[PDB]
Amino acid sequence: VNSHLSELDEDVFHHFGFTTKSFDFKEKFGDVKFVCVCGSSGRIHNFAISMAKLAGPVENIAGSHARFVLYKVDHILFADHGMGIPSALIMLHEVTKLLHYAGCKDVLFIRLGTSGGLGVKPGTIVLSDRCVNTKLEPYNELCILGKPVRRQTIVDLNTVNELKKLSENLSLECSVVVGGTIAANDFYEEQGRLDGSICTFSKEEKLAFLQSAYEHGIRNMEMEGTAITSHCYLTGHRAILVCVTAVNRLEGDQITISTDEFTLFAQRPGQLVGEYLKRNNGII
Amino acid sequence: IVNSHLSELDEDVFHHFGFTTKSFDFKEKFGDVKFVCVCGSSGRIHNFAISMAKLAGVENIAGSHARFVLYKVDHILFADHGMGIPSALIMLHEVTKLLHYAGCKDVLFIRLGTSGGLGVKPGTIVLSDRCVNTKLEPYNELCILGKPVRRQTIVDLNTVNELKKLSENLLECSVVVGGTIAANDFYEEQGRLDGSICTFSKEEKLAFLQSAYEHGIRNMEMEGTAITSHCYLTGHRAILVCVTAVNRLEGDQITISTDEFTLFAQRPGQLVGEYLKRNNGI
Ligand SMILES: Cc1c[nH]c(=O)[nH]c1=O
Ligand SMILES: Cc1c[nH]c(=O)[nH]c1=O
C-alpha cells in the first residue's frame, strides 16, 4: 500500500472524474471481485448491459468530462482503458486505488480486447498464458524518476484453465486457444506491419520476426497486456487477457474484415467471459 | 522517406479512423491541408473545430464506430489521439498516410493538450521548444522487430517563435517557451506520489522535478516525443501548445474544478486559433 494516499484528505480520480468525497467507496464498490476492461468505451458499455440483463439500463459512474467510463453490475466493475500501455496504466492506477479505498481484495482483472493473430483464424479467442514484450520478455518496462524499472508479468493461469475448460462445455462459433501474447508500443512498426507511414524493414525481416514469435508459442499481439498483468500482481490482484483476433498477421497486416464482422468478432470475448462470470458469482 | 510497401496495396484501410483510400478522393479532398490540430479528447478537439468553423465562415469524417474522430475546417484537419505515445503513434501513422495519399507536403502538426506544470502557474500555456523523455533525452524510443531504435525530437522552432510573438499582441494567462517531458505513465513516471504504486521518496521526487525545471522543463505530458519525432521523419513539422493544470513543484493532485479545467484546456485553442487565422489556416 502506497503510504502517501493517507496524507490526502481527498483523492481526486482525474481521469474518472470523481473523488473519494463523491461517494463512499466501500459501500459503492466494496462487493467488486471482477474488473472487466477493454479499449473501447462503447464496447465495454455493450458488455456491461449484457451482464446486467443476465443479472436481472447501465449508468456511467464516471464523470461527464472524464476520459474513461465506469460501470457496475453486481460484483463486476466495467471500465475502458484506451489504447496502449501508458493509457492502460492510467486506468490501472486509478481503478486499483479505487479497489483499495473500497476494501476490495484479490480482484480479478479481465481484459477483453482485440488483437492481431499469429497462425490462427480471424475471430479466434486467445487466452494469454503469458504476456511478453516485442523481445518476448515477460516484463513491463517503466522509467521512474529517469531510472529503468522492470516488472514481471503474471497471468492467472488457474482462471485461464477454467476458461479453457468452460469453452469446451460451450458451443461458441470460434476456437478458444491458449497461447502467449505480445504487447507492443505501436500498432504498426513495433507489430512488424509493412503498411505504416514509416517502415524500415523488409517483408522477409518481418516474417522472420513474426514466425519466430509464433514458434515461441505467441498466438496474438496487442498493446496493453504487459501493463495489466504486471500491475495487478504487484497490487495484490489477478489478471487475464481474453482477446479475439481480427487478422492473421502471418498472412497480412490490413484489417480487411467489415465493420459489422469486426463488431461480432470483438463481442466474442464477452460471450466466453460473460458465461464465466455468470457461473463464478460475477452476477446474481 | 516514403514506405514503398504502400503502393503494393490496392486499398489501404485506416482501421482506427474507419475508412479506406476508396472512401474518398484523397488528393482532391485533403490536398489543401496545411494544418493538423490534435489532442487527447475527441470532445475538446471537436469543440475547437466548431470554434474554428464559426471563425471561418462540424461533421465527423471518421467512421461511426472508429477509435478516433476526424474533422476538417478549410485547410486544417482535426483529430484526437487519446493518451500516451502508442495511441498517438496510431493517429500519427494513419494521419500521415492520409497526407501522403493526398499529396500534402510540409504539414505543421499542432498538439493542443493538457499537462502538469513545473514552476509555472496553473493555466499557463507552455510552448515546447523541445520534447524529451523522462531522462531528458530529445528522443523517442521504439522497439522495432525486437531491435532498439531511437528517433530524435525536432520542434518547429520558427513557428514556436511566431506563436510567442503573437501571444504578446493578444491573454490573461502567461505563455512560456520551455522544455516538455513526455512520460509513459500519468503517475509513477511523472514522479507522482498519489498513484496506486510509489517506490520513491519525496526527496527523490523533488530532486527529480527540480532538476527538470532547472534544465528548462516547464511542463509534463505523455505524447510529445512521439509527435515531434514522427512528423520530422515523415517530412512534416510539429509543435506542442499545452496548458498546465497543476504546478508539480507544489502538488500531484488535479485539485482544480472540471469547469476550470475545461476553461484551461480551451486556452491553447484560443492562441492557436488566431495563429491559424493569420497564417492562412482558414
Ligand atoms: C487487430 C489488432 C488489434 N490490436 C493490435 O494491437 N493489433 C492488431 O493487429
Ligand atoms: C495535468 C496533466 C496532464 N497530462 C499529463 O501527462 N500530466 C499531467 O499532470
Side-chain angles (χ1 to χ4, degrees), chain A residues 1-2 4-8 10-20 22-26 28-52 54-63 65-104 106-146 148-164 166-168 170-172 174-202 205-277 279-283, chain B residues 1-8 11-21 23-27 29-53 55-58 60-64 66-104 106-146 148-157 159 161-163 167-168 173-202 205 207-232 234-249 251-262 264-271 273-282:
Chain A
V1 171
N2 180 15
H4 303 95
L5 297 189
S6 54
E7 304 172 358
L8 301 176
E10 184 179 21
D11 193 348
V12 182
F13 300 78
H14 176 53
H15 300 86
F16 276 100
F18 51 65
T19 81
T20 50
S22 306
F23 26 69
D24 182 87
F25 276 32
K26 289 190 301 296
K28 186 77 161 182
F29 307 114
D31 54 328
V32 175
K33 288 288 298 188
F34 296 100
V35 174
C36 295
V37 297
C38 84
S40 163
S41 65
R43 296 213 328 268
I44 198 61
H45 186 23
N46 268 1
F47 178 56
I49 303 161
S50 292
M51 297 310 299
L54 264 62
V58 178
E59 307 293 348
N60 189 14
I61 303 179
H65 295 82
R67 306 297 185 104
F68 297 136
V69 295
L70 187 68
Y71 310 107
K72 182 179 190 296
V73 176
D74 289 342
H75 309 295
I76 318 172
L77 207 57
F78 305 87
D80 62 335
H81 58 54
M83 295 173 293
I85 286 169
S87 184
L89 281 175
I90 297 184
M91 178 275 297
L92 285 167
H93 278 284
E94 295 194 6
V95 169
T96 46
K97 279 208 303 182
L98 181 152
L99 303 178
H100 173 67
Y101 298 135
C104 296
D106 193 32
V107 179
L108 172 63
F109 279 74
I110 307 179
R111 165 163 156 63
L112 308 178
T114 57
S115 63
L118 278 71
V120 297
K121 180 184 184 186
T124 300
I125 290 168
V126 171
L127 312 180
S128 309
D129 54 9
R130 66 169 188 166
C131 290
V132 300
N133 57 13
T134 52
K135 309 192 206 66
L136 312 186
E137 298 167 329
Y139 304 88
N140 187 38
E141 288 169 5
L142 325 92
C143 192
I144 306 180
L145 306 191
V149 174
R150 297 173 67 184
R151 295 172 177 172
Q152 187 173 354
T153 62
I154 303 295
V155 175
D156 183 13
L157 293 186
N158 287 38
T159 300
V160 164
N161 198 341
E162 295 301 326
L163 270 176
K164 174 60 177 171
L166 170 62
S167 63
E168 302 167 358
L170 303 178
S171 67
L172 304 168
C174 70
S175 287
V176 174
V177 181
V178 183
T181 300
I182 293 176
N185 288 328
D186 176 22
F187 181 85
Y188 288 91
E189 286 181 272
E190 292 205 359
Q191 295 194 26
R193 275 193 164 79
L194 300 166
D195 57 342
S197 63
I198 310 179
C199 185
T200 67
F201 52 83
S202 66
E205 290 170 327
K206 164 200 187 179
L207 298 188
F209 176 73
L210 298 180
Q211 184 65 29
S212 173
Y214 174 83
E215 299 183 14
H216 280 81
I218 303 301
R219 289 302 175 267
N220 63 341
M221 193 176 279
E222 46 87 53
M223 299 176 63
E224 296 85 29
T226 51
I228 298 186
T229 55
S230 68
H231 190 86
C232 296
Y233 174 82
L234 191 51
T235 48
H237 299 282
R238 288 165 297 116
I240 60 173
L241 266 69
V242 183
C243 298
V244 74
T245 65
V247 66
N248 181 5
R249 289 298 311 296
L250 295 185
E251 289 201 343
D253 292 328
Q254 295 266 306
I255 309 304
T256 54
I257 60 181
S258 63
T259 303
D260 283 347
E261 177 152 326
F262 190 94
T263 294
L264 270 54
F265 282 9
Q267 286 173 347
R268 287 186 175 175
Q271 298 176 190
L272 177 61
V273 172
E275 186 65 39
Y276 174 86
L277 292 173
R279 302 182 184 199
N280 286 266
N281 301 127
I283 60 178
Chain B
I1 184 188
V2 170
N3 177 15
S4 49
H5 300 111
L6 263 42
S7 58
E8 307 170 359
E11 182 184 22
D12 198 351
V13 178
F14 299 85
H15 177 58
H16 301 85
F17 278 96
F19 49 74
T20 69
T21 46
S23 305
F24 331 98
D25 191 355
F26 278 47
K27 271 172 164 48
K29 185 175 183 179
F30 303 107
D32 56 328
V33 172
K34 291 295 298 185
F35 294 107
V36 180
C37 295
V38 301
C39 78
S41 171
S42 62
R44 301 213 323 263
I45 196 60
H46 186 211
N47 291 338
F48 178 56
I50 293 176
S51 72
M52 289 308 294
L55 177 58
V58 187
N60 186 18
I61 311 304
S64 51
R67 302 303 181 105
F68 301 124
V69 298
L70 182 62
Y71 314 106
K72 183 178 186 295
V73 175
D74 287 348
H75 298 246
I76 320 167
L77 271 180
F78 299 83
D80 52 339
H81 56 57
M83 296 179 294
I85 289 172
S87 182
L89 284 175
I90 296 183
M91 181 273 294
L92 290 170
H93 273 285
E94 301 195 359
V95 168
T96 49
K97 279 205 302 179
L98 179 146
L99 300 176
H100 170 69
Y101 289 133
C104 300
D106 199 22
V107 178
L108 161 72
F109 276 55
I110 306 176
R111 164 169 158 61
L112 318 148
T114 64
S115 56
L118 285 75
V120 297
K121 180 183 182 179
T124 298
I125 294 176
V126 173
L127 305 177
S128 303
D129 51 15
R130 73 165 185 170
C131 298
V132 295
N133 60 13
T134 48
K135 308 173 187 180
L136 304 188
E137 305 166 338
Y139 302 87
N140 191 37
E141 286 169 355
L142 307 90
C143 190
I144 305 177
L145 304 189
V149 171
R150 300 174 62 88
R151 298 172 178 174
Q152 188 178 344
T153 61
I154 307 291
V155 180
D156 179 9
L157 293 187
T159 303
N161 189 309
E162 292 301 317
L163 271 185
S167 67
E168 300 173 356
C173 67
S174 301
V175 175
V176 178
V177 177
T180 305
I181 297 180
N184 288 325
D185 169 28
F186 183 85
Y187 289 93
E188 294 188 87
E189 297 215 350
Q190 294 194 32
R192 280 189 161 85
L193 305 159
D194 60 336
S196 65
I197 306 174
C198 187
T199 60
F200 52 88
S201 63
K202 193 152 202 166
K205 169 201 180 182
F208 170 73
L209 295 185
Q210 181 65 23
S211 175
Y213 176 84
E214 302 182 359
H215 281 91
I217 305 300
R218 291 300 173 268
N219 67 336
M220 186 172 296
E221 47 90 55
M222 298 177 64
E223 295 88 30
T225 54
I227 295 189
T228 60
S229 68
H230 190 87
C231 296
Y232 182 77
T234 46
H236 297 289
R237 293 167 291 116
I239 58 173
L240 262 65
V241 185
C242 303
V243 74
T244 68
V246 69
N247 181 5
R248 293 298 314 292
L249 295 187
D252 295 326
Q253 292 270 300
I254 308 304
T255 57
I256 64 176
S257 63
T258 71
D259 285 351
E260 190 172 3
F261 188 92
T262 299
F264 283 5
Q266 288 181 329
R267 287 183 174 179
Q270 301 175 1
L271 180 63
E274 267 296 315
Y275 170 86
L276 297 173
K277 177 182 182 178
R278 306 184 178 194
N279 293 266
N280 196 26
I282 61 177

Short mmCIF file of all heavy atoms in Angstrom, two decimals, chain B residues 2 5-6 20 31 33 46 91-92 103 110 112 118-119 122 128 137 165 174 195 199 232 249 275 278 280, unseen atoms left out:
data_model
loop_
_atom_site.label_atom_id
_atom_site.label_comp_id
_atom_site.label_asym_id
_atom_site.label_seq_id
_atom_site.Cartn_x
_atom_site.Cartn_y
_atom_site.Cartn_z
N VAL B 2 9.74 7.52 -48.06
CA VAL B 2 8.42 7.02 -48.41
C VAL B 2 8.39 5.49 -48.38
O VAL B 2 9.16 4.84 -49.07
CB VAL B 2 8.00 7.52 -49.80
CG1 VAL B 2 6.75 6.81 -50.28
CG2 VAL B 2 7.81 9.03 -49.80
N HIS B 5 5.99 -0.12 -49.55
CA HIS B 5 5.01 -1.20 -49.43
C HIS B 5 3.58 -0.72 -49.64
O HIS B 5 2.68 -1.50 -49.95
CB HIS B 5 5.12 -1.86 -48.05
CG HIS B 5 6.46 -2.47 -47.79
ND1 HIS B 5 7.34 -1.97 -46.85
CD2 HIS B 5 7.08 -3.55 -48.33
CE1 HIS B 5 8.44 -2.70 -46.83
NE2 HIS B 5 8.30 -3.67 -47.72
N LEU B 6 3.37 0.59 -49.48
CA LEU B 6 2.04 1.18 -49.59
C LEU B 6 1.48 1.05 -51.00
O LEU B 6 0.28 0.82 -51.17
CB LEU B 6 2.09 2.65 -49.16
CG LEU B 6 1.67 2.93 -47.71
CD1 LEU B 6 2.25 1.90 -46.74
CD2 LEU B 6 2.06 4.33 -47.28
N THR B 20 -11.27 3.97 -45.81
CA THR B 20 -10.18 3.49 -46.65
C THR B 20 -9.80 4.51 -47.71
O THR B 20 -10.36 5.61 -47.74
CB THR B 20 -10.55 2.16 -47.36
OG1 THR B 20 -11.57 2.40 -48.33
CG2 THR B 20 -11.03 1.13 -46.35
N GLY B 31 -5.93 17.45 -50.28
CA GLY B 31 -4.74 18.01 -50.90
C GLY B 31 -4.35 19.41 -50.46
O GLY B 31 -3.21 19.84 -50.64
N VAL B 33 -4.76 20.51 -47.28
CA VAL B 33 -4.46 20.53 -45.86
C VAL B 33 -3.03 20.99 -45.60
O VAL B 33 -2.08 20.41 -46.12
CB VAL B 33 -4.66 19.14 -45.21
CG1 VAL B 33 -4.15 19.16 -43.77
CG2 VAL B 33 -6.13 18.76 -45.24
N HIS B 46 -13.25 18.54 -31.14
CA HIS B 46 -14.43 18.86 -31.93
C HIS B 46 -14.88 20.28 -31.64
O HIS B 46 -15.20 21.04 -32.56
CB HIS B 46 -15.57 17.88 -31.64
CG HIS B 46 -16.77 18.06 -32.52
ND1 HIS B 46 -18.05 17.80 -32.09
CD2 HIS B 46 -16.88 18.48 -33.80
CE1 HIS B 46 -18.90 18.05 -33.07
NE2 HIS B 46 -18.21 18.46 -34.12
N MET B 91 -2.54 7.37 -34.32
CA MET B 91 -3.03 8.56 -35.00
C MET B 91 -2.01 9.06 -36.03
O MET B 91 -2.36 9.37 -37.16
CB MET B 91 -3.34 9.68 -34.00
CG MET B 91 -3.88 10.96 -34.64
SD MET B 91 -2.59 12.12 -35.18
CE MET B 91 -1.88 12.58 -33.60
N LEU B 92 -0.75 9.12 -35.62
CA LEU B 92 0.30 9.68 -36.46
C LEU B 92 0.51 8.86 -37.73
O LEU B 92 0.64 9.42 -38.82
CB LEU B 92 1.61 9.80 -35.68
CG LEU B 92 1.64 10.85 -34.57
CD1 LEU B 92 2.88 10.70 -33.71
CD2 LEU B 92 1.55 12.26 -35.16
N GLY B 103 -1.09 14.06 -51.08
CA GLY B 103 -0.03 14.85 -51.68
C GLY B 103 0.33 16.08 -50.87
O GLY B 103 0.92 17.03 -51.39
N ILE B 110 -0.12 20.42 -34.87
CA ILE B 110 -0.26 21.18 -33.63
C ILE B 110 -1.01 20.41 -32.55
O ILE B 110 -2.23 20.24 -32.62
CB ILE B 110 -0.99 22.52 -33.86
CG1 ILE B 110 -0.32 23.33 -34.96
CG2 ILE B 110 -1.03 23.32 -32.56
CD1 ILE B 110 -1.05 24.61 -35.30
N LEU B 112 -2.67 20.28 -29.05
CA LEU B 112 -3.27 21.20 -28.09
C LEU B 112 -3.71 20.45 -26.83
O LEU B 112 -4.89 20.18 -26.64
CB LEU B 112 -4.47 21.91 -28.70
CG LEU B 112 -4.33 22.38 -30.15
CD1 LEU B 112 -5.68 22.32 -30.85
CD2 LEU B 112 -3.77 23.79 -30.18
N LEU B 118 5.64 22.90 -14.32
CA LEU B 118 6.80 22.93 -13.45
C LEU B 118 7.28 24.36 -13.25
O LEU B 118 7.87 24.96 -14.15
CB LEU B 118 7.94 22.08 -14.02
CG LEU B 118 7.86 20.55 -13.94
CD1 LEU B 118 6.86 19.97 -14.94
CD2 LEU B 118 9.24 19.96 -14.16
N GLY B 119 7.03 24.91 -12.07
CA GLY B 119 7.46 26.26 -11.76
C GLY B 119 6.62 27.33 -12.44
O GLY B 119 7.00 28.50 -12.47
N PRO B 122 -0.77 27.35 -12.62
CA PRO B 122 -1.80 26.55 -13.30
C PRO B 122 -2.61 27.41 -14.27
O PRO B 122 -3.08 28.48 -13.89
CB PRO B 122 -2.66 26.03 -12.16
CG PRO B 122 -1.74 25.98 -10.99
CD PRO B 122 -0.83 27.17 -11.15
N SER B 128 6.34 24.30 -26.25
CA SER B 128 7.51 23.43 -26.20
C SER B 128 8.58 23.91 -27.17
O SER B 128 8.31 24.07 -28.36
CB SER B 128 7.13 21.98 -26.52
OG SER B 128 6.14 21.51 -25.63
N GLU B 137 16.15 13.21 -22.51
CA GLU B 137 16.76 12.98 -23.81
C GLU B 137 15.77 13.33 -24.92
O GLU B 137 14.61 12.91 -24.87
CB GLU B 137 17.21 11.53 -23.95
CG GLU B 137 18.16 11.07 -22.85
CD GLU B 137 18.31 9.57 -22.80
OE1 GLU B 137 17.41 8.86 -23.32
OE2 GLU B 137 19.33 9.08 -22.26
N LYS B 165 5.38 35.58 -30.12
CA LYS B 165 5.19 36.97 -30.52
C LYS B 165 3.71 37.31 -30.68
O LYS B 165 3.29 38.41 -30.34
CB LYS B 165 5.94 37.25 -31.83
CG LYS B 165 7.45 37.13 -31.72
N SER B 174 -0.12 33.39 -18.72
CA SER B 174 1.23 33.53 -19.26
C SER B 174 1.45 32.54 -20.40
O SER B 174 0.82 31.48 -20.44
CB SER B 174 2.28 33.33 -18.17
OG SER B 174 2.11 34.26 -17.11
N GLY B 195 -0.15 7.74 -6.87
CA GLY B 195 -0.55 6.63 -7.71
C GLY B 195 -0.85 5.41 -6.85
O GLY B 195 -0.77 5.48 -5.62
N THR B 199 7.41 3.95 -5.41
CA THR B 199 8.64 3.30 -4.98
C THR B 199 9.73 4.30 -4.60
O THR B 199 10.85 3.91 -4.27
CB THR B 199 9.19 2.36 -6.07
OG1 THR B 199 9.47 3.11 -7.26
CG2 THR B 199 8.18 1.27 -6.39
N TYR B 232 8.79 15.02 -38.22
CA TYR B 232 10.08 15.32 -38.84
C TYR B 232 10.53 14.19 -39.75
O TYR B 232 11.05 14.42 -40.85
CB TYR B 232 11.15 15.58 -37.77
CG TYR B 232 12.51 15.96 -38.32
CD1 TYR B 232 12.76 17.23 -38.81
CD2 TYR B 232 13.56 15.04 -38.33
CE1 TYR B 232 14.01 17.58 -39.30
CE2 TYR B 232 14.81 15.38 -38.82
CZ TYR B 232 15.03 16.65 -39.31
OH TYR B 232 16.27 17.01 -39.80
N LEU B 249 5.59 21.23 -8.82
CA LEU B 249 6.54 21.59 -7.78
C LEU B 249 5.82 21.84 -6.46
O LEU B 249 6.46 22.01 -5.42
CB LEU B 249 7.35 22.82 -8.19
CG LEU B 249 8.27 22.65 -9.40
CD1 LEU B 249 9.15 23.88 -9.59
CD2 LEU B 249 9.12 21.40 -9.26
N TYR B 275 -3.57 32.26 -34.60
CA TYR B 275 -2.42 31.96 -35.45
C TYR B 275 -2.88 31.42 -36.79
O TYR B 275 -2.44 31.88 -37.85
CB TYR B 275 -1.49 30.95 -34.77
CG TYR B 275 -0.41 30.41 -35.69
CD1 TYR B 275 0.79 31.09 -35.85
CD2 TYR B 275 -0.58 29.22 -36.38
CE1 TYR B 275 1.78 30.61 -36.68
CE2 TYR B 275 0.40 28.73 -37.22
CZ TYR B 275 1.58 29.42 -37.36
OH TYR B 275 2.57 28.93 -38.19
N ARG B 278 -4.28 34.01 -39.09
CA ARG B 278 -3.32 34.96 -39.65
C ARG B 278 -2.26 34.29 -40.51
O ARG B 278 -1.39 34.96 -41.08
CB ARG B 278 -2.66 35.77 -38.53
CG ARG B 278 -3.64 36.45 -37.60
CD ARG B 278 -2.94 37.32 -36.57
NE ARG B 278 -3.89 38.02 -35.71
CZ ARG B 278 -3.57 39.03 -34.90
NH1 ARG B 278 -2.32 39.46 -34.85
NH2 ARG B 278 -4.50 39.60 -34.16
N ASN B 280 -3.20 31.79 -42.92
CA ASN B 280 -3.94 31.11 -43.97
C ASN B 280 -4.40 29.71 -43.55
O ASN B 280 -4.39 28.77 -44.34
CB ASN B 280 -3.08 31.03 -45.24
CG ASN B 280 -3.89 30.70 -46.48
OD1 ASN B 280 -5.08 30.97 -46.55
ND2 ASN B 280 -3.23 30.09 -47.46
#
